[PDB]
């Protein structure tokens, strides 16, 4: 079988230990009082450290991958509690914070009968066998012509283990549980077997102790199951570990934007240079353990359209820090910023651009190299390039009038029939170009202000009663011009008798191009035919 | 681009015919084949850059990437007596040469002309590549010395990307011409299309010829080529397209065709120059209006036409292809749901053309666009603390933000199970109430102690304000009558 986007990244299951021992203090003091007698420096529970680290991992992932990368968050005490599901709807950090608040901190003075991390480890193996929405969609599209969609997942377990012996018992329990449950998923239609599972066992312990658990490198326990074991102090070390792990599980790289000139608005000497670090998919650095890109101060006379070979969502490492929050909101407020790849070459290299789009910040990969399209041929030396009288500004109005706009539904009714927006756009371009001379000297009527009220509505598929009146009024005015013998613009870019015959013939050409649109169109032509001068 | 790698070793001075059927040495038919290639390029593929590398004991770049096929042509007569200096594999030289100019994302074709005579290895090339080997020895000769299997290995090492060309017959001029002719047809025939905007049309070439795209060798393995009818479907302002990521960029250029499909001389582009052409109209308007034209490449595949955006370079009409699929650019939404303004209820762009329907925004806010609580770094805790205190002093003017900041810290502390923090803040607040100055609005002390008391009750966990939804409200007091270093950072646009 194959994995596409259905690798292990697709399904990640957290299993955090909520047994009474997790209420113990990480013993890393925190100074919540900066500047009499400051308050007692407090400390977080091992539980709190684990929920912090795992939520920050989930934040970074959710920013870089708002779709198709899913998480089930399970807490384990006397039983398992899965705080969300696989649906993309349920991939919401806020609802998770509420669930976590409702399980609460572990009770130190409780004796929950039969409590252990094993409850949630089973639950992890069980939910890995439930189909996601994207999995269910791919099975239903690949038919029995495949239904070899891969089903692989990852289980991240934060706990307080007893010993190396104890940790190995957990691996073996997962190993047997995957083996037995896969048999059920086999003779189950609503469940998929686990084709590969990666198990990450994170033992965390208070600062000042020596862990009873030692790191164990990745080991193949099963054709399905691989497993590894980390020992790491709670607090900032546990946090650093899950930051390293999120980058490895999702193929992320780090970029620090350097030399951002910042300052405090309510100060003077506040001018200073700052550095902000972002995470994004590693593909952003392919053209090129942190990559530095130097801030380039924005020139308001910059290029509006950049050649971009890729665009990658970012998540700031320190999202609430003052300098990152500065960079972020600058981008969010509409500004873009170009980034330079440092080189002692001398020739400055603009390799990237940061730009927000509707509130989501992408890192754009630019072209640093010479362009194979450099020095194109001159318009004047090619076909039609010796023509001096292109209706450029008239055609630009055509473009403005045929700008596209997003519609909410896949289709919308027109005449009791459902139409595709982009199809209707394409159909309008057809009507607007049935008669559209490209150069000034090839038209009389499109050089005439008096014809606009007619020419601008006759191309519509139906005419309002007001549209009809303005069409007749245009025709009536042309009769007045011919009677006054007003000069017409057919000039170089003969006899006035001929001028009007030509002008009327062209107006008739335009109208006849549209008489099949509607019966009102037909009547506009009857009016033209009756009011014009005939040879 | 193209790099011609030309063998100038001694073996290439052997006669093509020991029977004297023709007078040429191998190097002479090689130059005849290249002359044919350069002449084709010069008239049917003019925009292509070509470099010329020569090699024997050493190698040298003789002609750097150029579109001047005359200098390339003139180089052939003078290449045996050109000084070679470099001492790696010429194929190492090709790698350095290609990436030093174009980077490593541009498809280059490497044309190796030789008779075959028998750290990171250069193959497969680090860029998208074809290796075409033009054998100046016939098949029977190549087979008779196992040289044919070596050359065939090079294609294998370049993952079959490329081809060996051989003559099974007399190594004469007609056969070498036939051979380079086959290379031309395979690798240098222009891509011709029709550019359409409704009834406005122009016959065009798309340069370079776009490479056939494969999405997912499992989920969708069929290579995609762009439709030859390039249908414009609508226009979008440059500010709304906002520098989208694209697969590749192309010049789109008009071509003069005949009844026979014949691209038509010192007098032909004269009469072609006086015939109005939709490419010029479209290009000029696009530049003046600052727009792009969205173009359909095939079912669920779109791209854009636009003019050169740097105003100091020559401009001409260009096309970029988007990634295939129904929604390549999130901020535009699904291409098929882009429609005409005439069908919208109100005009999305504003009565005074001062609005835009773009960008669409994602259904859910990212974390930097939305308040999030992050307390892993002790700085991040202190800043949320000093935020609550700064507003606690400014009461009752800022009770709103005071109680917004306060309830945020309450909710996050309950989510994380960090109940000690609730008691700790509650204690800071009641110190503030103690330390208040005697000029303080009287409401400040009532709010500070009510906040500090409600915050300690949430430490209790004993289903008081301990509930996640239960926010701390200000007291409704009836008083009837009258940032320094810890503020926001801004972007210093000076220096
Ligand atoms: Mg040799």
UniProtKB/Swiss-Prot annotation, chain A:
<dbReference type="GO" id="GO:0016180">
    <property type="term" value="P:snRNA processing"/>
</dbReference>
<dbReference type="GO" id="GO:0005654">
    <property type="term" value="C:nucleoplasm"/>
</dbReference>
<dbReference type="GO" id="GO:0016604">
    <property type="term" value="C:nuclear body"/>
</dbReference>
<dbReference type="GO" id="GO:0160232">
    <property type="term" value="C:INTAC complex"/>
</dbReference>
<keyword id="KW-0175">Coiled coil</keyword>
<dbReference type="GO" id="GO:0032039">
    <property type="term" value="C:integrator complex"/>
</dbReference>
<keyword id="KW-0498">Mitosis</keyword>
<dbReference type="GO" id="GO:0007052">
    <property type="term" value="P:mitotic spindle organization"/>
</dbReference>
<keyword id="KW-1017">Isopeptide bond</keyword>
<comment type="function">
    <text>Component of the integrator complex, a multiprotein complex that terminates RNA polymerase II (Pol II) transcription in the promoter-proximal region of genes.</text>
</comment>
<comment type="subunit">
    <text>Component of the Integrator complex, composed of core subunits INTS1, INTS2, INTS3, INTS4, INTS5, INTS6, INTS7, INTS8, INTS9/RC74, INTS10, INTS11/CPSF3L, INTS12, INTS13, INTS14 and INTS15. The core complex associates with protein phosphatase 2A subunits PPP2CA and PPP2R1A, to form the Integrator-PP2A (INTAC) complex. INTS13 is part of the tail subcomplex, composed of INTS10, INTS13, INTS14 and INTS15. Interacts with transcription factors ZNF609 and ZNF655. Interacts with PAFAH1B1; this interaction may be required for proper recruitment of dynein complexes to the nuclear envelope at prophase.</text>
</comment>
<keyword id="KW-0963">Cytoplasm</keyword>
<dbReference type="GO" id="GO:0080154">
    <property type="term" value="P:regulation of fertilization"/>
</dbReference>
<dbReference type="GO" id="GO:0043231">
    <property type="term" value="C:intracellular membrane-bounded organelle"/>
</dbReference>
<dbReference type="GO" id="GO:0090435">
    <property type="term" value="P:protein localization to nuclear envelope"/>
</dbReference>
<keyword id="KW-0539">Nucleus</keyword>
<keyword id="KW-0832">Ubl conjugation</keyword>
<keyword id="KW-0597">Phosphoprotein</keyword>
<protein>
    <recommendedName>
        <fullName>Integrator complex subunit 13</fullName>
    </recommendedName>
</protein>
<keyword id="KW-0132">Cell division</keyword>
<comment type="similarity">
    <text>Belongs to the Integrator subunit 13 family.</text>
</comment>
<dbReference type="GO" id="GO:0051301">
    <property type="term" value="P:cell division"/>
</dbReference>
UniProtKB/Swiss-Prot annotation, chain B:
<dbReference type="GO" id="GO:0005654">
    <property type="term" value="C:nucleoplasm"/>
</dbReference>
<dbReference type="Pfam" id="PF20504">
    <property type="entry name" value="IntS14_C"/>
</dbReference>
<dbReference type="GO" id="GO:0034472">
    <property type="term" value="P:snRNA 3'-end processing"/>
</dbReference>
<dbReference type="GO" id="GO:0034243">
    <property type="term" value="P:regulation of transcription elongation by RNA polymerase II"/>
</dbReference>
<keyword id="KW-0007">Acetylation</keyword>
<dbReference type="InterPro" id="IPR002035">
    <property type="entry name" value="VWF_A"/>
</dbReference>
<dbReference type="Pfam" id="PF13519">
    <property type="entry name" value="VWA_2"/>
</dbReference>
<dbReference type="InterPro" id="IPR036465">
    <property type="entry name" value="vWFA_dom_sf"/>
</dbReference>
<feature type="binding site">
    <location>
        <position position="11"/>
    </location>
    <ligand>
        <name>Mg(2+)</name>
    </ligand>
</feature>
<dbReference type="GO" id="GO:0016180">
    <property type="term" value="P:snRNA processing"/>
</dbReference>
<feature type="modified residue" description="N6-acetyllysine">
    <location>
        <position position="387"/>
    </location>
</feature>
<protein>
    <recommendedName>
        <fullName>Integrator complex subunit 14</fullName>
    </recommendedName>
</protein>
<comment type="similarity">
    <text>Belongs to the Integrator subunit 14 family.</text>
</comment>
<keyword id="KW-0479">Metal-binding</keyword>
<feature type="binding site">
    <location>
        <position position="85"/>
    </location>
    <ligand>
        <name>Mg(2+)</name>
    </ligand>
</feature>
<feature type="domain" description="VWFA">
    <location>
        <begin position="1"/>
        <end position="183"/>
    </location>
</feature>
<feature type="binding site">
    <location>
        <position position="9"/>
    </location>
    <ligand>
        <name>Mg(2+)</name>
    </ligand>
</feature>
<dbReference type="GO" id="GO:0160232">
    <property type="term" value="C:INTAC complex"/>
</dbReference>
<dbReference type="InterPro" id="IPR045814">
    <property type="entry name" value="IntS14_b-barrel"/>
</dbReference>
<keyword id="KW-0539">Nucleus</keyword>
<dbReference type="InterPro" id="IPR046471">
    <property type="entry name" value="IntS14_C"/>
</dbReference>
<keyword id="KW-0460">Magnesium</keyword>
């Amino acid at each position: 079988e194959f994995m596409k986007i259905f690798s292990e990244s697709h399904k990640t299951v957290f299993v955090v230990d909520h047994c009474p021992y997790m209420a113990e203090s990480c013993r890393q003091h925190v100074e919540f009082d900066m500047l009499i007698i400051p308050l007692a420096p407090i400390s977080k529970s091992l539980w709190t450290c684990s929920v912090e680290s795992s939520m920050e991992y989930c934040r970074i992932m959710y920013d870089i991958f708002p779709f198709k990368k899913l998480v089930n968050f399970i807490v384990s005490d006397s039983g398992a509690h899965v705080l969300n599901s696989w649906t993309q709807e349920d991939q919401n950090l806020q609802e998770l914070m509420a669930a976590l608040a409702a399980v609460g901190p572990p009770n130190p003075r409780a004796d929950p009968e039969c409590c252990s991390i094993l409850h949630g480890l089973v639950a992890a193996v069980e939910t890995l066998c439930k189909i996601t929405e994207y999995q269910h969609e791919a099975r239903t599209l690949l038919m029995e012509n495949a239904e070899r969609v891969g089903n692989r997942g990852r289980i991240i377990c934060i706990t307080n283990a007893k010993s190396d012996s104890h940790v190995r018992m957990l691996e073996d329990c997962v190993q047997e549980t995957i083996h037995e449950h896969n048999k059920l998923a086999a003779n189950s239609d609503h469940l998929m077997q686990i084709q590969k599972c990666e198990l990450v066992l994170i033992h965390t312990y208070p600062v000042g102790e020596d862990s009873l658990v030692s790191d164990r490198s990745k080991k193949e326990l099963s054709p399905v199951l691989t497993s590894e074991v980390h020992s790491v102090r709670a607090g900032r070390h546990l946090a650093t570990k899950l930051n390293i792990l999120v980058q490895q599980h999702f193929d992320l790289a780090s970029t620090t934007i350097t030399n951002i000139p910042m300052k405090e608005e309510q100060h003077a000497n506040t001018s200073a240079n700052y550095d902000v670090e972002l995470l994004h998919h590693k593909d952003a650095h392919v053209d090129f353990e942190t990559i530095t890109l130097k801030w380039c101060t924005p020139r308001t006379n910059n290029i509006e359209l950049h050649y971009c070979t890729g665009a990658y969502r970012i998540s700031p490492v320190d999202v609430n820090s003052r300098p990152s929050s500065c960079l972020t909101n600058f981008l969010l407020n509409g500004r873009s910023v170009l980034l330079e790849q440092p080189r002692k070459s001398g020739s400055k290299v603009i390799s990237h651009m940061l730009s927000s789009h509707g509130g989501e910040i992408f890192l754009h990969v630019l072209s640093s190299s010479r362009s194979i399209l450099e020095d194109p041929p001159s318009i004047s030396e090619g076909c039609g390039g010796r023509v001096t009288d292109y209706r450029i500004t008239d055609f630009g109005e055509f473009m403005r009038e045929n700008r596209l706009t997003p519609f909410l539904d896949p289709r919308y009714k027109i005449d009791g029939s459902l139409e595709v927006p982009l199809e209707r756009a394409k159909d309008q371009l057809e009507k607007h170009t049935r008669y559209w001379p490209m150069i000034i000297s090839q038209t009389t009527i499109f050089n005439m202000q008096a014809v606009v009220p007619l020419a601008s509505v006759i191309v519509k598929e139906s005419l309002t009663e007001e549209d009809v009146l303005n069409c007749q009024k245009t025709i009536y005015n042309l009769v007045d011009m011919e009677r006054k013998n007003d000069p017409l613009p057919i000039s170089t870019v003969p006899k006035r008798d001929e001028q009007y015959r030509i002008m009327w013939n062209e107006l008739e050409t335009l109208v006849r191009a549209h008489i099949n649109n509607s019966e009102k169109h037909q009547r506009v032509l009857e009016c033209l035919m009756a009011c014009r001068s005939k040879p | 681009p193209t790099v011609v790698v030309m063998d100038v070793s001694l073996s290439m001075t052997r006669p093509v015919s020991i029977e004297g059927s023709e007078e040429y040495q191998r190097k002479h038919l090689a130059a005849h084949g290249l002359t044919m290639l350069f002449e084709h390029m010069a008239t049917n593929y003019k925009l292509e850059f070509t470099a010329l590398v020569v090699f024997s004991s050493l190698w040298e770049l003789m002609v750097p990437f150029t579109r001047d096929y005359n200098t390339l042509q003139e180089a052939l007569s003078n290449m045996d007596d050109y000084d070679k200096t470099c001492l790696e594999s010429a194929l190492v030289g090709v790698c350095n040469i290609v990436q030093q100019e174009w980077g490593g994302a541009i498809p280059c074709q490497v044309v190796l002309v030789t008779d075959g005579c028998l750290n990171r290895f250069p193959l497969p090339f680090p860029f998208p590549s074809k290796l075409y080997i033009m054998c100046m020895a016939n098949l029977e000769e190549l087979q008779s010395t196992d040289s044919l299997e070596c050359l065939e290995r090079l294609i294998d090492l370049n993952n079959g990307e490329g081809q060996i060309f051989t003559i099974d017959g007399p190594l004469c001029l007609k056969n070498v011409q036939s051979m380079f002719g086959k290379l031309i047809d395979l690798a240098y025939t222009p891509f011709h299309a029709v550019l359409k905007c409704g009834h406005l049309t122009a016959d065009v070439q798309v340069f370079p010829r776009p490479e056939p795209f494969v999405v997912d060798e499992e989920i969708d393995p069929i290579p995609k080529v762009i439709n030859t009818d390039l249908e414009i479907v609508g226009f979008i302002d440059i500010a709304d397209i906002s520098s989208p990521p694209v697969l590749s960029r192309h010049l789109v250029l008009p071509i003069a065709l005949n009844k026979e499909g014949d691209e038509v001389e010192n007098s032909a582009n004269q009469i072609a120059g006086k015939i109005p052409n939709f490419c010029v109209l479209l290009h000029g308007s696009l530049k003046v209006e600052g727009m792009v034209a969205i173009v359909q490449l095939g079912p669920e595949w779109h791209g854009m036409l636009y003019s050169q955006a740097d105003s100091k370079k020559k401009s001409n009409l260009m096309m970029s292809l988007f990634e295939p699929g129904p929604e390549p650019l999130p901020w535009l939404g699904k291409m098929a749901q882009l429609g005409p303004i005439s069908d919208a209820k109100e005009n999305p762009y504003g009565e005074d053309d001062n609005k835009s329907p773009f960008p669409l925004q994602p259904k859910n806010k990212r974390s930097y666009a939305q308040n999030v609580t992050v307390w892993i770094k002790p700085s991040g805790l202190q800043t949320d603390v000093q935020k609550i205190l700064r507003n606690a002093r400014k009461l009752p003017e800022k009770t709103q933000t005071f109680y917004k900041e306060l309830n945020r810290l309450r909710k996050a502390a309950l989510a994380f199970g960090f109940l000690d923090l609730l008691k700790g803040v509650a204690d800071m607040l009641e110190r503030e109430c103690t330390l208040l100055p005697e000029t303080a609005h009287p409401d400040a002390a009532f709010q500070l102690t009510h906040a500090a008391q409600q915050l300690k009750l949430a430490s209790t966990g004993t289903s008081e304000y301990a509930a996640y939804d239960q926010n701390i409200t200000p007291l409704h007091t009836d008083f009837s009558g009258s940032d320094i270093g810890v503020g926001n950072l801004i972007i210093d646009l000076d220096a």
